[PDB]
Structure 1
Amino acid sequence: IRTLLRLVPAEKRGAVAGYAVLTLLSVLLRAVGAVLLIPLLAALFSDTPSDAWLWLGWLTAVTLAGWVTDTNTARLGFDLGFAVLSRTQHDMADRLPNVAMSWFTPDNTATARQAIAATGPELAGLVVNLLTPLIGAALLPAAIGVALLFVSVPLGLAALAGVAVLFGALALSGRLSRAADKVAGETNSAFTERIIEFARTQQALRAARRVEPARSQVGSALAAQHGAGLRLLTMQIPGQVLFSLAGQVALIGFRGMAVWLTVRGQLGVPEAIALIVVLVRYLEPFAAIADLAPALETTRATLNRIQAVLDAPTLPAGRRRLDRTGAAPSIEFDDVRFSYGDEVVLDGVSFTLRPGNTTAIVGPSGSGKTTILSLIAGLQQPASGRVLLDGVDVTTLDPEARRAAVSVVFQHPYLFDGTLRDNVLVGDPEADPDDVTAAMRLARVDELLDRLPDGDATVVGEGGTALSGGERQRVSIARALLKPAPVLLVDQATSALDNANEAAVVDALTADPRPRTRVIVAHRLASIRHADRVLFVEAGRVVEDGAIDELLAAGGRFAQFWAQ
């Protein structure tokens, strides 16, 4: 419960206090109603049945109060569960765009996918489904044992000894199945990730004869999942056995104490008859708690996933804002060192780019020329250095002003499942239809509209898979051009576009009306057509820079790059 309370909003902690008070009150009312039988039956079966009206009236008052407190506890539990759901999901949605790229390891991505996917009703109504019945069942036998003190001190104190064994059995049941449940969850998560991968790359698996379950990764994952699940089912038998034994031992203790009291004459026969009913009520929570152990363990796992996602490390950021909202900001690198793990990617990269120019970055694959644009865009951040936009370090910029000052054409153009216009519109959703049409026209997306039956309403699939590679690249370029960001980056310009579309898009990128600082990465000389400045990066260091014609005349490594 410690991991859950920290997740509740500070708004709702008054509701949490109300919930806890009403839970205790409801348990006490239920225990009073259980033990109010003993005076009631003692008076009813005795020679004067008229003395049962008082206890019947008190029982009616107690059960009405129990109904009222239970409806109110249900309302508060539902509200708390959904408030925790909404706040946790919103915090995960707001935090993940700020989480460092290094955090999205395969296991961390699996945890994040599972945590967001745990937004269903299984977690929303967690309080009502788990915490209310669990606490009620846990505190009812103790509450009855305390209440039995009024009827008889030794009987009540003997009944409470049945709660110590209850807690012992609960702890043992949890700790015996802790390992098997963890392995079951691990295998289930691995199977989920393998199903997603299997359905996501069906082409490569099919062509490689690695799809059928006798030979595939999803098949091995399913076999391991089945083994872990059967082991878990086998390993939950000790929990049920221990709870049954605890209930039986509590019955033996209660029965022995009641028989001793009746034999000694301190307890009437009708009181013992009522104590049979009270014993039946006392024993029922032993079974109810045994039902909720798997639910409790799954809830613990889900909340650990959610807290792991909320604990992820966000990127460093400041509160500055760029001076030139519209004008072209100069992009500068000054001793920018970046590294993936122990691998050095950039070592002392230093280049100053004039505002408003068109800069070209070229070089062998694996050089680091997409990492330069990643650093300029702020997706990454230097390990030791300072990327400046118009003299202002990007690390100190507010995130909103950071993302409002760069537009990027990614190397692998991911597109969200939705209409084509919804993918282009994300570049600037408040943009007028004229701006969207101009952006589509520049990026040569008008060819798609005349070709596809639905025009710009055509639905793209998972990723950009329901369009050709060049078509989704052109949609990505349209998206990037639609944004009014003064800086424009291009990780790979026209990789999947034919010669005509490539030439048209290359003209359009340099011919966009507003002023911008344009950095473009390319592997073909036609796509750096009339670039003001050129940079050649070979192993994370700018080997040479200058004009295209100057580099060709110099005969350096840029000149022999295209000789082949």
Structure 2
Amino acid sequence: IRTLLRLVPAEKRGAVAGYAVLTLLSVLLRAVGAVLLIPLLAALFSDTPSDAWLWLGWLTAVTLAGWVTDTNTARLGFDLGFAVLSRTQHDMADRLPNVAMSWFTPDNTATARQAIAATGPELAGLVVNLLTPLIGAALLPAAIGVALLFVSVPLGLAALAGVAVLFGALALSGRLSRAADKVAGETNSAFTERIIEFARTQQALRAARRVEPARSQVGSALAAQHGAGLRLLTMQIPGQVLFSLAGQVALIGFAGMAVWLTVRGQLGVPEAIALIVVLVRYLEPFAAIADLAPALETTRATLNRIQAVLDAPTLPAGRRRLDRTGAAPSIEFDDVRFSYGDEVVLDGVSFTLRPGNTTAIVGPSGSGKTTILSLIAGLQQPASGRVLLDGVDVTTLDPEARRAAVSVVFQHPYLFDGTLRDNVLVGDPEADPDDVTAAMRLARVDELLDRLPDGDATVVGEGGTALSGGERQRVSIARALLKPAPVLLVDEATSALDNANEAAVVDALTADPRPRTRVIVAHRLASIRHADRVLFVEAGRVVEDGAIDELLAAGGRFAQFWAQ
């Protein structure tokens, strides 16, 4: 195969050659071991059987050297399979946090999930279970043919004729079944994605009665997945028939040329009898290739998914760094433009944030507020224009410095499955417990510790599913505040919290003792308390901006926003 030699490490290319040399050597030893029965039995049946010892000794030397070769190529294939497994997986794990957000379409996300889901033993045992026996079965009929040229040239050519039939059948079997095998993979992938939606969206589906398989989209996907599954089973009938014809055609050719030589005296009777066993050894790779041929197309799709992930467009980056790690940077946008596909979110927003102060952003739903925060935090990047941290373009900044210079509170607080403390410690794992306790206290997560039975060991579910809407929001705020980065971004921290908890969190977002440049995306007039500056964003541009009192006195769009 051609894609596996690309995914293989540059370190292991020495080991790849040792694999290739030994797998060829095993094929030659297996063919020579098969063909060594011809002179062995020819001498065994003769009037002097003692001459059989020479070929038996050669047979023992050839077969024991097979075991050493096949054991060594198995160890090498095991290493190369796991070296490819570790290498490809770590490259997908390193690349995916750098991939552009636009790459995560519903199809690509399924591809990434499937590619990551190939970490199981099936991909690890690629070389041992597929390529070693595929190469062995593809070349052993050819090797047995070449080994028979020493016995009789016309017979060796007959076997090579049967080899050409084999490779023809192998090429055609893949050709016929490829159209149906693609559809089987597409339908099976969609079925997986719909099971995940089915389990994640159980609440909404059940209320809408789209949960039973007769009416559910997962139930339809199971029907299409079954239709394509059965079609593939039928469309693989030509492949099995064609291999069976190839195995029979080669049997007639090899057996015919053996009897044509035997009657004419060019081959003795014992050589013909030995050739029956060599024919059987020669015919086994025909059936084995039929068993391995279906696996070749699945693995080709699997490596195509992994290669799709690795070829994904990473985000631009440089190697710059901020002047100071912990000092408050100045954030500014300079004709930043952005667009999700054809839809345009920002049309040249331009603003400047003084370092250490707190600023607020407000505007109608879908205006672009979370887009502005994502550009600040580096999740997105502009189609054109620049976002500067302390005068340093985000695009030219090192990934590690860019990641460490921002902590954000997301609109839809996602917590990873695991305990409550683990999600808090994600902000800064090295932090001592005194900083962790201070982070929780500021976020009113201490109230969860009192009320909840397991305290900080509370096992959150998938996402923040096993916590309240406000409880997961508070855990997210504690995670964000724990990170010591000098910029803090708040995206609807007031959405899911009662009036008492909202006031405590709003007070604590500004009462944090570290110096940071704060951007607040709030909802209420009271949620923007202690805000030095406010930016009104509407239709993708900052239409109005100023202080709370100044904008209220002006009676502009800001005042009309609260009037409903």
Normalising by the residue count of structure 2, what TM-score does the alignment of the two structures yield? 0.99
Residue 374 of structure 1: SS of its match in structure 2? helix
After superposition, what is the alpha-carbon deviation per residue over 1:253-282, rounded to whole angstroms, capped at 9, x for unaligned?
111111111111111011111011111111
> 1:183 Cα shift?
0.2
Q: 1: distance between equivalents of 2:77 and 2:344?
A: 52
> 1:334 Cα shift?
1.2
- 1:339 matched to 2:339? The reply is yes
> 1:475 Cα shift?
0.3
Q: 1: distance between equivalents of 2:216 and 2:319?
A: 50
Q: 1: distance between equivalents of 2:556 and 2:383?
A: 31
> 1:444 Cα shift?
0.3
> 1:521 Cα shift?
0.6
- 1:480 matched to 2:466? The reply is no
After superposition, what is the alpha-carbon deviation per residue over 1:439-462, rounded to whole angstroms, capped at 9, x for unaligned?
000000011000111000010000
> 1:308 Cα shift?
0.0
After superposition, what is the alpha-carbon deviation per residue over 1:395-452, rounded to whole angstroms, capped at 9, x for unaligned?
1110000010011000000000000000000000000100000000000001100011
Q: Percent identity?
A: 100
* Range moving further from structure 2, 433-442 or 518-527: 518-527
After superposition, what is the alpha-carbon deviation per residue over 1:495-527, rounded to whole angstroms, capped at 9, x for unaligned?
100001000000000000011100001111111
Q: 2: distance between equivalents of 1:80 and 1:493?
A: 49
> 1:14 Cα shift?
0.7
> 1:356 Cα shift?
1.1
Residue 81 of structure 1: SS of its match in structure 2? helix
Q: 2: distance between equivalents of 1:154 and 1:432?
A: 82
Q: 1: distance between equivalents of 2:322 and 2:134?
A: 55
Q: 2: distance between equivalents of 1:357 and 1:451?
A: 35
Q: 2: distance between equivalents of 1:141 and 1:493?
A: 70
Structure 1 unaligned regions, length at least 5: none
Q: 2: distance between equivalents of 1:276 and 1:493?
A: 80
* Range moving further from structure 2, 42-51 or 498-507: 42-51
Q: 2: distance between equivalents of 1:404 and 1:284?
A: 60
After superposition, what is the alpha-carbon deviation per residue over 1:54-78, rounded to whole angstroms, capped at 9, x for unaligned?
1111111111111111111111111
Q: 2: distance between equivalents of 1:422 and 1:280?
A: 62
> 1:160 Cα shift?
0.7
Match of 2:192 in 1: 192
Residue 10 of structure 1: SS of its match in structure 2? coil
Q: 1: distance between equivalents of 2:392 and 2:32?
A: 70
- 1:425 matched to 2:425? The reply is yes
After superposition, what is the alpha-carbon deviation per residue over 1:7-51, rounded to whole angstroms, capped at 9, x for unaligned?
110111111000000011100000111011111111111111111
Kept in 1: contact 2:247–2:283 (CA 8 A): yes
Kept in 1: contact 2:409–2:489 (CA 8 A): yes
Residue 407 of structure 2: SS of its match in structure 1? strand
Q: 2: distance between equivalents of 1:138 and 1:343?
A: 53
Residue 488 of structure 1: SS of its match in structure 2? strand
Residue 266 of structure 2: SS of its match in structure 1? coil
> 1:288 Cα shift?
0.4
After superposition, what is the alpha-carbon deviation per residue over 1:85-110, rounded to whole angstroms, capped at 9, x for unaligned?
00000000000000000000000000
| TM alignment of 1:4-403, pairs within 5 A | 4-403=4-403
Q: 1: distance between equivalents of 2:132 and 2:494?
A: 59
After superposition, what is the alpha-carbon deviation per residue over 1:183-211, rounded to whole angstroms, capped at 9, x for unaligned?
00000000000000000010000000000
Kept in 1: contact 2:494–2:523 (CA 8 A): no
Q: 2: distance between equivalents of 1:14 and 1:336?
A: 49
Residue 473 of structure 1: SS of its match in structure 2? helix
Q: 2: distance between equivalents of 1:324 and 1:526?
A: 34
Q: 2: distance between equivalents of 1:493 and 1:123?
A: 43
> 1:116 Cα shift?
0.1
> 1:559 Cα shift?
1.1
> 1:537 Cα shift?
0.6
How many residue pairs align between the two structures? Answer: 564
Kept in 1: contact 2:419–2:460 (CA 8 A): yes
After superposition, what is the alpha-carbon deviation per residue over 1:346-381, rounded to whole angstroms, capped at 9, x for unaligned?
112111111111100001001111111111001011
> 1:324 Cα shift?
2.3
Residue 3 of structure 2: SS of its match in structure 1? helix
Residue 251 of structure 1: SS of its match in structure 2? helix
> 1:176 Cα shift?
0.1
Kept in 1: contact 2:370–2:491 (CA 8 A): yes
Q: 2: distance between equivalents of 1:251 and 1:349?
A: 76
> 1:541 Cα shift?
1.0
> 1:493 Cα shift?
2.2
Q: 2: distance between equivalents of 1:334 and 1:62?
A: 74
Match of 2:562 in 1: 562
Residue 523 of structure 1: SS of its match in structure 2? coil
After superposition, what is the alpha-carbon deviation per residue over 1:521-557, rounded to whole angstroms, capped at 9, x for unaligned?
1111111012000000111111111110011111111
Q: 2: distance between equivalents of 1:395 and 1:273?
A: 75
After superposition, what is the alpha-carbon deviation per residue over 1:450-480, rounded to whole angstroms, capped at 9, x for unaligned?
0111000010000000000000000000000
Q: 1: distance between equivalents of 2:256 and 2:46?
A: 24
After superposition, what is the alpha-carbon deviation per residue over 1:280-306, rounded to whole angstroms, capped at 9, x for unaligned?
111111000000011111110100000
Q: 2: distance between equivalents of 1:449 and 1:493?
A: 19
Residue 395 of structure 1: SS of its match in structure 2? coil
> 1:561 Cα shift?
1.1
Which 4+ runs in 1 deviate beyond 3 A? none
Q: 1: distance between equivalents of 2:304 and 2:242?
A: 27
Q: 1: distance between equivalents of 2:541 and 2:385?
A: 14
Match of 1:549 in 2: 549
Q: 1: distance between equivalents of 2:417 and 2:372?
A: 29
Residue 150 of structure 2: SS of its match in structure 1? helix
Match of 1:462 in 2: 462
> 1:239 Cα shift?
0.7
Q: 2: distance between equivalents of 1:519 and 1:443?
A: 17
RMSD (Å), alpha carbons = 0.7
Q: 1: distance between equivalents of 2:390 and 2:147?
A: 75
Q: 2: distance between equivalents of 1:312 and 1:514?
A: 38
Kept in 1: contact 2:424–2:478 (CA 8 A): yes
* Range moving further from structure 2, 342-351 or 29-38: 342-351
After superposition, what is the alpha-carbon deviation per residue over 1:221-272, rounded to whole angstroms, capped at 9, x for unaligned?
0000000000000111111110010011111111111111111111101111
Q: 2: distance between equivalents of 1:355 and 1:391?
A: 11
| TM alignment of 1:530-549, pairs within 5 A | 530-549=530-549
